[PDB]
Amino acid sequence: NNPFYLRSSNSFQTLFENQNGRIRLLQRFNKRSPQLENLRDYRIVQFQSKPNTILLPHHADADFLLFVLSGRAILTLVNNDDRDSYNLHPGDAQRIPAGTTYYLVNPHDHQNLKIIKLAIPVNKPGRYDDFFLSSTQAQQSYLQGFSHNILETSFHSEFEEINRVLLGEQRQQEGVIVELSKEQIRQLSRRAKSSSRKTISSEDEPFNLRSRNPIYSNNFGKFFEITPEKNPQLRDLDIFLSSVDINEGALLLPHFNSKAIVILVINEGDANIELVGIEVQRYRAELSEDDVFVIPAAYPFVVNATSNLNFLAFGINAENNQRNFLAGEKDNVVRQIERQVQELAFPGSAQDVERLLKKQRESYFVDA
Amino acid sequence: NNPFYLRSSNSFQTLFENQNGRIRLLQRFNKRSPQLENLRDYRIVQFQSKPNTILLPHHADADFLLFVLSGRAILTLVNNDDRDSYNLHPGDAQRIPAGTTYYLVNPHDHQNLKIIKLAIPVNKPGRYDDFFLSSTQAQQSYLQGFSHNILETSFHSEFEEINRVLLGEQRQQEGVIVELSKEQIRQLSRRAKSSSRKTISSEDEPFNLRSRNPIYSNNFGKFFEITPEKNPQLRDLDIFLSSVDINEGALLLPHFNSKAIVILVINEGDANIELVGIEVQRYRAELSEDDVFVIPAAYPFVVNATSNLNFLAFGINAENNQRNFLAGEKDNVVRQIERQVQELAFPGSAQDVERLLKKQRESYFVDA
Amino acid sequence: NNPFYLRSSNSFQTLFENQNGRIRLLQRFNKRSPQLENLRDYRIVQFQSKPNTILLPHHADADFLLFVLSGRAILTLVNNDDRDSYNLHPGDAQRIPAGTTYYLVNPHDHQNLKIIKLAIPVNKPGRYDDFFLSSTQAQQSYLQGFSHNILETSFHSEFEEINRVLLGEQRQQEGVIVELSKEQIRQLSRRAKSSSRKTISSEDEPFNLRSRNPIYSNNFGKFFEITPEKNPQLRDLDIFLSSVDINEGALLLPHFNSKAIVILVINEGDANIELVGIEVQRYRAELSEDDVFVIPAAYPFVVNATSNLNFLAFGINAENNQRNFLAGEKDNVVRQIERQVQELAFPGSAQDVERLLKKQRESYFVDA
Secondary structure: OOOOEEOHHHHOOEEEEEOOEEEEEOOOHHHHOHHHHHHOOOEEEEEEEOOOEEEEEEEEOEEEEEEEEEOOEEEEEEOOOOEEEEEEOOOEEEEEOOOOEEEEEEOOOOOOOEEEEEEEEOOEOOEOOEEEOOOOOOOOOHHHHOOHHHHHHHHOOOHHHHHHHHHOOOOOOOOOEEEOOHHHHHHHOOOOEEOOHHHOOOOOOOEEOOOOOOOEEEOOEEEEEEOOOOOHHHHHHOEEEEEEEEOOOEEEEEEEEOOOEEEEEEEEOOEEEEEEEOOOEEEEEEEOOOOEEEEOOOOOEEEEOOOOEEEEEEEEOOOOOOEEEOOOOOOEOOOOOOHHHHHHHOOOOHHHHHHHHHHOOOOOEEEO | OOOOEEOHHHHEEEEEEEOOEEEEEEOOHHHHOHHHHHHHHOEEEEEEEOOOEEEEEEEEOEEEEEEEEEOOEEEEEEOOOOEEEEEEOOOEEEEEOOOOOEEEEEOOOOOOEEEEEEEEEOOEOOEOOEEEOOOEOOEOOHHHOOOHHHHHHHHOOOHHHHHHHHHOOOOOOOOOEEEOOHHHHHHHOOOOEEOOOOOOOOOOOOEEHHHOOOOEEEOOEEEEEEOOOOOHHHHHHOEEEEEEEEOOOEEEEEEEEOOOEEEEEEEEEEEEEEEEEOOOEEEEEEEEOOOEEEEOOOOOEEEEEEEEEEEEEEEEOOOOOOEEEOOOOOOEOOOOOOHHHHHHHOOOOHHHHHHHHOOOOOOOEEEO | OOOOEEOOOOOEEEEEEOOOEEEEEEOOHHHHOHHHHHHOOOEEEEEEEOOOEEEEEEEEOEEEEEEEEEOOEEEEEEOOOOEEEEEEOOOEEEEEOOOOEEEEEEOOOOOOEEEEEEEEEOOEOOEOOEEEOOOEOOOOOOOOOOOHHHHHHHHOOOHHHHHHHHHOOOOOEOOOEEEOOHHHHHHOOOOOEEOOOOOOOOOOOOEEHHHOOOOEEEOOEEEOOEOOOOOHHHHHHOEEEEEEEEOOOEEEEEEEEOOOEEEEEEEEEEEEEEEEEOOOEEEEEEEOOOOEEEEOOOOOEEEEEEEEEEEEEEEEOOOOOOEEEOOOOOOEHHHOOOHHHHHHHOOOOHHHHHHHHHOOOOOOEEEO
């Protein structure tokens, strides 16, 4: 029983689901273990949709940091006087500020669309709600939460004309994810500003994580990372975003983040993971696809890919965070201590500890 | 039983009250219902005084944002080396940082003073204490907490002498709201820096909501707003203030705030409010003077004025908030959704939906 | 039973102890009383070590602000690619960012090293672990929490080798504080960059409190203070620091902090304290060496030095705090009230109250 490990088979909850897609909502990081109390303002959401589909317009009382894992998406935020569409390619991340009206389009003809978004609620710490303008057989419109009179007066129309057209009390769709026509998706898809190299530092438009050189790259893995220091949208939430690939056989060298609580959601592959906290204590767990693991601050952990692996991470409390590795060449903390202290720290000689710490010639990603 | 509705008749608790006025303190937002757990650090205080009165020198462990609803006050914040007097007119807001000693004078001869302040306690979340320098039949001077021994040394005098002059253990006032002499009102008034139009963006002196033009305004209402973008003192608290007037029979069209939790205080008039949440849920309540009603972020709501109405709204989590109306013409977000999305959203055409939304030729406030 | 008084003989808890020093942790501020709930995030640690000792390398899931009470010291912070050593003298203070590995050496040949540090946990509010890199009879290195397989792969080595050198499953030391060879403390002493006059506004380097002129100084007491305004480290924490010596028989005139919660620890000598909260509630207390007294924000309090006293204060939420005195000539709020409001606020004339306030002709510290 690993309180920091959430098995996707019994730790998500499906909000809506039909033949065109499903939306799933992770449970609450502190109802799992109160050790996770400082994540109580966060939730993980997973969205998947078949090709040629639309998530009907809606808003929620929560900041959204959405990241596109695979597929292509049209993200359209509607304002009161304005509108903004965006063409999302894999790797792209975008913030939906709380209570924006927005719909998602999957224009691809044969590929799905998988989005994980980080959700920070406004009203209730950890708990949020989805407001759907649309009138579906699944959900009532929140327009229906008003009275006949208040609707009549507000639309300057009698109630049948506003019922035959807005609410529909057989005429209305089956779900909050429905199919589209190609003539629609053709018309929709032409005005959507897409991600670029010059967006790595924009307060509006979506940025791509991988579009820059990783920070860690070798023949066994690559470590893409954007931090609050480079991107204003992330400075506002104080979160780093990282996508790292781990080739099968290889592993990520045991390390700890200095001050950041990391939320990693496995995207592809399998992996084992070892975490140490306090007399020491090992937190191992066997992660497959769509699972989630969370690493407390300054908690050293190893990620061991037992198949071809890519995960996404969320770094909570990400300002000025430092990754300290414990083995390998570059960015070792144990190889920076004064020699006479290394003598004193472990039962060994300065030369004898200097022997063991220099052996491993490679840094970050080694082979197993 | 509306969790978001707080009724004056049974939601307030009187901190002090005599013939000359009374300070009432609204119940904690979170004690009412855990739904409001985010406002736990906020309290609403009502202050009311009779003419030619003064509230004796005190300080709280609590930041104040005080809004003079009716009357005219002469607010004097004292510091350890300075003294500041501010002539406040109805509509004036100012901010009393916490631990600032101050007093409050009603100089008028026939009118009452009706102030409401939003309070942000420092020490214990949602709970502060008032600390009166003065020694009155209703409360000791907090200099009495100390021992006689310490008092003699600190002031360099025998205790009989300091107890005759500061504490008075019949020569003392009845309460903390005392009556005034005209000659003294004559003296205390003449130095008061008055709120201006150059002050709308000043870090000290107060600032008048109504001074600039309304954000919205037709023949059925006026919406006055002021935001952290325009005002330093408000950007600090990250709050917007708004005062809005609805004519008898008119209503504020259905709309929602994006991320701002709005504490509205009904100041004059009578309304019916309708809040919607989630399957939808109507939260209707019928409101009268001094009533309080909290609208969570991203919750749609309509204000129906059943008699000429004016309320005050505190906006919590204000920075970059957006008001999205569901009906009318200007700032309707239903009317910004792409046409092909209106086909698929509501049960009916996009010429049928384009027909309905165009009916109401007005915006913001309309007539019932 | 005063909820703001943490007696040293039953409010502390030893983390580790041996012949070479010990490390206690002050109990949770809120556990004691729910009144101290806004201190839920802060902890106090006490560090005392013998001459020519070391604290083996380690880190914590906590920010640290460590203050040097007495002794000299070498503090070494090791990064993934850098190492930095600081020479700490009495009255020096440094921030150790969360999860920064570090060790601490006492280079002096007879003097102890008393250090005290305020801690801000990053994972559990008010709760953090130490992670010791070293292998010792008292603790396991947090490398033991990885499997053999994983350990072997990472280092590139048989387990029989990484155990013989790093872990040791007799050859290992007894505690986390060990004694040192004089040539060893010699070699650790010669790169340490020391605190200066150049370092009171340096984001990296330690700063001396007593390095600048006190804010208050007279033949009975000195008052040193560094504020968020003048230091970059105390501004990201939003905290002030103060050392204040009070000669025996003197005292620190009644006063209160406008918005700072103050944690004070007594460094030497004895004081009586009186604190007033609210009808007025005195909270009196006879403090000795090592006790902690908390003053919530805006509560007036006095410190009464029964023996050549000096103490340390951590100011929580210090940005723009004002100190406000009630006796003595300078910084006297009670002297800044208008005359005619002095008439109304106490039983006594303006001539009468003016007379009694002018009597004490000194400021800040006076002879009792």
